[PDB]
Amino acid sequence: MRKYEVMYIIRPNIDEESKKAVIERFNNVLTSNGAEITGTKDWGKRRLAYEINDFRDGFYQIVNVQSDAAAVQEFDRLAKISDDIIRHIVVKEEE
Amino acid sequence: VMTDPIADMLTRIRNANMVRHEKLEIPASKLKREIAEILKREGFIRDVEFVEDSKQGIIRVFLKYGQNNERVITGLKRISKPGLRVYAKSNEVPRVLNGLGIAIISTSQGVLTDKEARAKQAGGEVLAYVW
Amino acid sequence: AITQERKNQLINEFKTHESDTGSPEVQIAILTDSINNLNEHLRTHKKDHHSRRGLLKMVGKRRNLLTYLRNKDVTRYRELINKLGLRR
Amino acid sequence: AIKKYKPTSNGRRGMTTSDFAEITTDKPEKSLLAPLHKKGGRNNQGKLTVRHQGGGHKRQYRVIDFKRDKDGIPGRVATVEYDPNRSANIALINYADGEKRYILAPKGIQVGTEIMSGPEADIKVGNALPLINIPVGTVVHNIELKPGKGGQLVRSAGTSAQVLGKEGKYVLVRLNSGEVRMILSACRASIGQVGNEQHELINIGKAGRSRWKGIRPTVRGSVMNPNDHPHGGGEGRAPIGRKSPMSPWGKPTLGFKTRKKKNKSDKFIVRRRKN
Amino acid sequence: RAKRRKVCYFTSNGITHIDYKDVDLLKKFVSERGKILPRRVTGTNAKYQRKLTAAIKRARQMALLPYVSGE
RNA sequence: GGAACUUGAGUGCAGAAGAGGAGAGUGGAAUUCCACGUGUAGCGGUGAAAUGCGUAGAGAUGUGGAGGAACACCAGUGGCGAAGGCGACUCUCUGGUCUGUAACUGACGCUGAGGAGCGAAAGCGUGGGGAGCGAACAGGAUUAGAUACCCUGGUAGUCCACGCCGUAAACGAUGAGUGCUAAGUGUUAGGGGGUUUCCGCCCCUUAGUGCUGCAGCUAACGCAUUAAGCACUCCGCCUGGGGAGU
RNA sequence: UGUGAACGAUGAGGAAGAC
C-alpha cells in the first residue's frame, strides 16, 4: 500500500444535481477500490490557458488517499467511461 | 587486486624514492619486516618502526638520503613474480651491479644477502634485487 | 518487491545466530528470493535483456557463494540446498 | 500459436494449423445445435449460380444470438468451442437465467468472466452496449446496421472497428479497411475486436485440405474455350489481347466499379476507398 | 569570484516544495514567454531545477500553466 | 591440511539521486491531407532559371476534422547504463550505482580461451502502419558530357509487433582488476565538522566527470590520482608493403 | 581591471576538366 494524490476535472456547465451524481459515483468507485480517504480539497472553477475539448474553463477537484497498488488500474478506465469527466491524473505522493 | 604485498611494498619504496618524502607506511607481515631489516642492515634506509593497530599494520619506513643529494638507490627490481616461478642454486646466484649490489634471497635458514648466502652455501628463492 | 516483512520473516528462519544478519545462509536465501522474483519478472516480459543479464550476474553470485559453501561445510550445504530444493 | 509441420511428405512442406488453444471442450451443447444442408452453391432452380462450391466436410450450426436482445442480466463464460462455419471462434456463455447462447468471441476473454448485455454494462471486453454510451475511439465488434437485426458487421476473426466520434444522429464508425459510415446511435454494438487474428497466417499447404473447406479448384480463364470464356481461344496461353480484362460475364473486373451510382446507403458514405 | 546575482531565493525559504499543488509559485517560475527560467537567473542547483522541471511538466498536465504563449 | 583475524569482498541497517529496462495509458505544438468560410493572380523554388502547383479559385487567412511520426524550449564537457546506447508526462513491474555511522559472514577475490547473452544504422522474413523525410526512379536545370552536387516529385526504407542478420571511425583508435605517485581550478550526488534557529559562509572526506599543470614516460605530438607515470594479475592482439581481409 | 586557451553546440555569399 502507498499514498496517492489524484486530480480530475468535471464539466463547468454541468447541473449541480448531476455533479452530485458524478461525485457520489466517483466516491462509490473510490471506496469500491479500497482507497481509504486521507484528505481532500475543492479547487473548483478555474479559467484555462487552453481548451481541452472546447471548454474555456473547468472544475478542478482533487483527492488524497491511502491505497493500492492495484486500484488505480481499475479506477483509470472507469474514469474514462464518463463523458462528463474531462481529464484525470494519479500522481504518487512523495513530496 | 592486491596480488602480492611484497612487490607492492617495492613499488612503495621506489615511488617513495621518486617523491622524496621522508617516510611512508606499509601493511605488516613478518616476511616484509625481515627483508626490511635486511635493508636496515645494508643501510640504504635510515630506520624502520612498526606501529600496532588491529589487526595487521602499520610499519613506517624512513628513507635515508645522501649528504650530497643523489638517490641512495639507483635501481630496485623484483625478478620473482607470480605466474613465473624462479629458482637459484647456491653457486648460480649472480652478483648484481658487481660488488656494490646485494641480492635478497629467501632461504631455508631465512632471508639472506648474497654474501651471507655464499658463506652459508644455502640456495633459495630470489625475492628481489636492490642497487 | 520483496516487501520488508517478508524479508524479516525470511532472515530469522535461516539465521544460525540470534543476530546472524550476514552468513552465506541468509545471503543465499535473500538472493534466492531476488532470483525468484526477478525470474518471474523475466517470465512476464521476454524483452527484459537488462534484467536477464542482471539475473546472470546474480546467478554468478549464487554460484560463487554456494561454491565456497561447498568448499567449507558440505553438511550445512546439503542441508541448505535440501531446505531450498535448488542446485541440480 | 502456429504449429509448423516437418516436411515428412510434399504436403507437409508448407501446411500449418492454428494452436486451437482457445478451445476447451471437445463437443457442443446439444440444445443449440442446428442442421446445415450444403446447397453446393446451386440455385433453387438447380443451376449453379456460384462457381466452385460444395464438396466440403459436413457441418452443424450452433445457434448464436448476435442481437443480444436481453439486457440487465449478467452472464458467464463457461466454455469456448471451434466453429467450422467461420474463422471466428465461438465461446459459450451461461446467463444467470440459466439460458445458454453461443456468442462471438473477442480475444483475451477468460473463462468465468461476468458479462452484462445491458446499457449499464462496463466497457470490459465481451460486453455489448449501445453506441451512445460508447466512449470515442474504443474498438468495437459485431456492430448491427439496425437494432434487432443482428450484427452483420465485423463477424470474421481478427477484424476491428473504431469510433471517430458521435452526434445524436448518427454515431461515426471506422469500418475495416478504413471506410466510414454514420451508423444509428440507438443501434447496439459490442466492444473489443474479434480474436483468432492468427487465422490469416495459416497455410493450407496442399490441395487436399482445400477439399475439406471445401474450396473447389478454379480453371484459369485463358485455358478455357473461347465459347465459355472471353479470354479463351488462341494457340497456347493466349495473350489478353482483347480489350479490357473481363469476367466470363460481360462486366470487366480489374478496377471497374460494380457499385450502383444511386443507392440508399450513398448518403451514409462519409468516406470511401482509402486503399 | 564568485557569486551569482538573483541566486536561489528558494532554499532560503524552502524546501521540499511543491511538488505541484501550488499555483502561485509556479506562476513565479513561468516567464512571459511561458517557459521555465534558466538557472542563470533562477539560481537553482541542477537537481532542484530538474525536479522543478518534471514538477512544472506535472503542472502542465494539470493545465495550471500555459504550455505556450506570446513572447 | 588444521586452528584464527578484518582491512579485500559480500550481506544488512539508515539514506541519495539517475533520458536505466520492459509494459499500458495520456499530452500539446507543428508538418500534411480533407471539409467549409474569406478573398484573387500568382504561389513555389534557384547562383540565375525552369520543371511543379493554381481561375476546375490556388497560395494566403479563419474554423473544424483526420492520421502518423517526433518530444522543442527545460538541456547543463549534466545523469544513468556493461557496451550499444537511453531526452514529453503518468502509472505498473524491475535491474544497477553511490554515501554513512557499522551489525554479520571471514578471503567467500581477480581475470578469463571455449561457450552463452546483449549488441548503432542499414538489410532480410511475416502481419500492420505510413504525416513528413527519402535511396531507386521520373522530370527540370548545371556541364563538352552530369547515370551527380541544385530544384520539383517520389517507391522501398524510415514507424509498430513477432524473428533473423551480429556488421560500424562499435573511438578515448588507450582491455579488465588493484596498489602507489605534486597539485590546482569547476561541476554530479552524498557524509562530517567550525559560528549562525535558519539563511548562508568556511574547512574536511567519498565516488562520477571537465580543464590546466609537478614528477615521471615518449620517435615526436602529448599523456599526466579519469597515465599513455611507477608496479602487479590475467585475457585479446601485432612481426615489411602490394597481392589480401581476396 | 579585466589576455590569450580551451571545450560542448552554428548559419551562409554563387556555375566550370586535366598535363
Instruction: Identify how many contiguous H helices and E strands chain E contains and give both numbers.
Output: 3, 0
Spatial distance from the CA of E67 to the C1' of F31 (Å): 19
Candidates B94, B30, B90; CA nearest to B59 is B30
| Burial label, B80 (beta-carbon count in 10 A; 0-12, 13-18, 19+) | buried
For residue E36, which nucleotide's C1' is closest to its Cα?
F74
For chain C, the 3-state helix, strand and coil shares in percent, each to the nearest 5, are 75, 0, 25
Cell representation of residue C27: 545471503
Buried b (16+ CB within 10 A) or exposed e, D93-122: bbeeeeebbbbbbbbebeeeeebbbeeebe
Q: What is the distance in angstroms between the Cα of E53 and the nearest Cα belonging to chain A?
A: 15
Q: Do C73 and C16 touch, CB atoms closer than 8 A?
A: no
DSSP secondary structure, chain B, as one string? ----HHHHHHHHHHHHHHHT-SEEEE---HHHHHHHHHHHHHTSEEEEEE---SSS--EEEEE---TTSS-S-S-EE---BTTB-----TTT---TTTTT-EEEEEETTEEEEHHHHHHHT----EEEEE-
The total number of residues written for chain C in this structure: 88
Buried b (16+ CB within 10 A) or exposed e, D188-199: bbbbbbbbbebe
Q: Do B73 and B15 touch, CB atoms closer than 8 A?
A: no
Distance CA D66, CA D21 (A): 24
Spatial distance from the CA of D1 to the C1' of F221 (Å): 63
Amino acid at the residue A14 = I
Distance CA E62, CA E64 (A): 5
Residues in chain A with CB shorter than 8 Å from the CB of E21 are 5
Distance CA E59, CA E49 (A): 15
Cell representation of residue D262: 444511386
Chain F positions with an atom below 7 A of a protein C-beta are: 5-8, 10-13, 17-23, 25-29, 64-67, 72-76, 78, 81-83, 87-96, 103-105, 107-110, 112, 117-119, 126-129, 162-163, 177-182, 186-190, 199-201, 215-216, 229-234
- The H or E element spanning position C33 is helix C23-44
What does this entry list as its resolution, in Å? 3.9
Distance CA B98, CA D192 (A): 95
Of A5, A48, A91, the CB nearest to E63: A48
| Chain centroid offset of residue B43 CA | 12
Q: Could you identify the residue written with the cell 629458482?
A: B87
Q: Which residues contact D274 (CB under 8 A, 6 or more apart)?
A: D177, D178, D179
Distance CA D249, CA D246 (A): 7
Spatial distance from the CA of B84 to the C1' of F237 (Å): 22
Distance CA C7, CA C15 (A): 12
Experimental determination approach used? cryo-EM
Which of the other chains make 3 or more beta carbon contacts under 8 angstroms with chain E?
A
Amino acid at the residue C72 = K
Distance CA D274, CA D177 (A): 7
Distance CA A65, CA C39 (A): 32
Q: Fill in the DSSP letter of residue E36.
A: B
| Chain centroid offset of residue A59 CA | 10
Spatial distance from the CA of B27 to the C1' of F7 (Å): 10
Q: Do D109 and D125 touch, CB atoms closer than 8 A?
A: yes
Of A7, A50, A94, the CB nearest to E62: A7
Candidates B62, B9, B63, B71; CA nearest to B35 is B9
Which of the other chains make 3 or more beta carbon contacts under 8 angstroms with chain D?
A
Q: Could you identify the residue written with the cell 635486511?
A: B38
Distance CA A34, CA A65 (A): 10
How many other C-beta atoms lie within 10 A of the C-beta of residue B13?
Answer: 20
Residues in chain A with CB shorter than 8 Å from the CB of D122 are 81
Q: What is the distance in angstroms between the Cα of A57 and the nearest Cα belonging to chain E?
A: 11
**What are the φ/ψ torsions at residue D119 (nearest 5 degrees)?**
-60, -30
Specify which residues D3 forms β-bridges with. D17
Q: Could you identify the residue written with the cell 479559467?
A: A47
**Residue B41 half-sphere exposure toward CB, CA atoms < 13 A:** 14
Beta-carbon separation of D122 and A83 below 8 A: no
Q: Could you identify the residue written with the cell 542446485?
A: C87
List the single best residue of E15, E16, E19 to mutate versus A (max A Cβ within 10 A): E19
Candidates B10, B73, B22; CA nearest to B47 is B22
Residues in chain E with CB shorter than 8 Å from the CB of A50 are 63, 66-67
Residues in chain E with CB shorter than 8 Å from the CB of A48 are 63
Q: What is the distance in angstroms between the Cα of A62 and the nearest Cα belonging to chain E?
A: 10
Q: Could you identify the residue written with the cell 475543492?
A: A42
Contact exists between E and A (3 or more beta carbon pairs < 8 Å): yes
For residue C37, which nucleotide's C1' is closest to its Cα?
F94
Spatial distance from the CA of E34 to the C1' of F31 (Å): 23
DSSP secondary structure, chain D, as one string? -EEEPP-SSTTTTT-EEE--TT---SS--GGGEE-----TTB-TTSSBSSSS--------EEPB-TT----S-EEEEEEEE--TTSSSPEEEEEETTS-EEEEE-BTT--TT-EEE-STT--SSTT-EEEGGGSPTT-BEES--SSTTS---SS-STT---B-----SS-EEEE-GGG-EEEE-TTSEEEES-BS-GGGGG----SHHHHHHHT------TTTS-TTT-TT--SSSS----SSS---SSSS--SS-----SS-GGGGGEEE----
Buried b (16+ CB within 10 A) or exposed e, B32-65: beebbebbbeeebbeebeeeeeeeeeebebebee
Specify which residues A37 forms β-bridges with. A65
Which of the other chains make 3 or more beta carbon contacts under 8 angstroms with chain B?
none
Q: Is E48 on the interface with A (CB under 8 A)?
A: no
Q: Is E67 on the interface with A (CB under 8 A)?
A: yes
How many other C-beta atoms lie within 10 A of the C-beta of residue D39?
Answer: 13
List the single best residue of D120, D123, D134 to mutate versus A (max A Cβ within 10 A): D123
Q: Is E14 on the interface with A (CB under 8 A)?
A: no
Distance CA C14, CA C25 (A): 7
Spatial distance from the CA of B62 to the C1' of F230 (Å): 19
**What are the φ/ψ torsions at residue D188 (nearest 5 degrees)?**
-80, 155
Specify which residues D226 forms β-bridges with. none
Tell me, letter by letter, the H, E, C secondary structure of D134-146: CCCCCEEECCCCC
- The H or E element spanning position A39 is strand A36-47
